[PDB]
């Protein structure tokens, strides 16, 4: 029965997503801030896709890592084929949605991942950051302020709904994100930003003493 | 299984 198969796949993926750490991505004055709970030092849940496009994920590592590699390949191919500015986060989100909606229905086991695609405006340009959330089934939702993935998303989202403020500074945004994520030290936090003030490449990780000073 | 982040 297709109904039973869809229900089983949805419940399996939903139980696999919540069996993982939490990642929060929120927009601030300088762009988009990525905060992830990652005790590991080699495996990363935050990565760059293109010049102004970021990547965040939560779930089974070997699945969203492959998805990230595929997205990087697609972005580089599109950029070289036409131009760097012809690549947009919307196209990457659409490709991810198609890939996940095909895998959810065709493969034996659906991917237990939840993707986040964030895009900021180009240098010297004014535009509100765009946040896209792609689920296991293949649905894409546009979030204006913040995205919560992995673990118990509801308490963190509730805390963010009370503590969020637009055009906040990097330090205030980091404090808010950490406070919502606790509901942590530098040895278990993976922090990166999409700095819209950067000339070409906006992605920039914040680790070490620089991270320690901020929080 | 294992390796969930």
């Amino acid at each position: 029965s297709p109904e039973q198969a869809m229900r089983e796949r949805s419940e399996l993926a939903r139980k696999g997503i919540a069996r993982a750490k939490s990642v929060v991505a929120l927009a601030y004055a300088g762009g988009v801030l990525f905060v992830a709970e990652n005790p590991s030092r080699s495996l990363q849940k935050i990565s760059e896709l293109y010049d102004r496009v970021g990547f965040a994920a939560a779930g089974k590592f070997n699945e969203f890592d492959n998805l990230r590699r595929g997205g990087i390949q697609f972005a580089d191919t599109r950029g070289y084929a036409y131009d760097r500015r012809d690549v947009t986060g919307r196209q990457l989100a659409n490709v991810y949605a198609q890939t996940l909606g095909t895998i959810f229905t065709e493969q034996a086991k659906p991917y237990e991942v939840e993707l986040c695609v964030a895009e900021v405006a180009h240098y010297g340009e004014t535009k509100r950051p765009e946040l896209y959330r792609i689920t296991y089934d293949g649905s894409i939702a546009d979030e204006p302020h913040f995205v919560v993935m992995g673990g118990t998303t509801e308490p963190i989202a509730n805390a963010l709904k009370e503590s969020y403020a637009e055009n906040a500074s990097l330090t205030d945004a980091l404090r808010i994100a950490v406070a919502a994520l606790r509901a942590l030290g530098v040895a278990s936090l993976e922090v990166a930003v999409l700095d819209a003030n950067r000339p070409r490449r906006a992605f920039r990780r914040i680790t070490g003493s620089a991270l320690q000073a901020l929080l | 299984l294992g390796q969930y982040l």
Binding site: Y82, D83, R85, D86, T88, Q91 | -
Partner: protein, 223 residues
Amino acid sequence: TTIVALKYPGGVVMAGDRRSTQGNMISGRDVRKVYITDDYTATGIAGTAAVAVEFARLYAVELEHYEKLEGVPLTFAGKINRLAIMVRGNLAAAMQGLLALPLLAGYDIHASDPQSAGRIVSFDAAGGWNIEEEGYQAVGSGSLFAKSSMKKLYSQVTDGDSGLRVAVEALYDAADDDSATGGPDLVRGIFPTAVIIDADGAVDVPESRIAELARAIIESRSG
């Protein structure tokens, strides 16, 4: 064959002649060599006529295909890259005598300054492209004469009308110095075609205006 393009404050204009030859024999007297690829770019191609027509058709099809698929038109750099890729891929046939050198003129809607949004791009046989900075470029057999005439006449360009007049005069000089380029034919009433691009898009210049400009130039030259 001679196709010219020049920038004026607030837009760009491209014009081309009408003659096609087979050696020393005149085979065509009303060939159109300037195409409106989309709402804001124009492409003139010199060389073999068949290859030029096929190039323009394929380029327009590719641009419209991308725009319909992605729901957003290509940036100007993307269009330049696609045309350069086509030119590079046509190199082997160009070595066999099927050469085609295109000239690209367009208006960039994403440019910061609307007055200087006009763009002129020239291509070589190897697919390399260069964005012109002096404000005028020409391709074809009579390209050198038209370019040297525009070098002297460009100081008079202040708006679309003056730019169109200068382009027509440059084509007239190119036809005067090159036998493969046709001049204004008053007996048959055949005049060069022109396209003007501005903030409102690309439109075809009516034949009456170009005929008036050609008659004025001829009367000026004859004294």
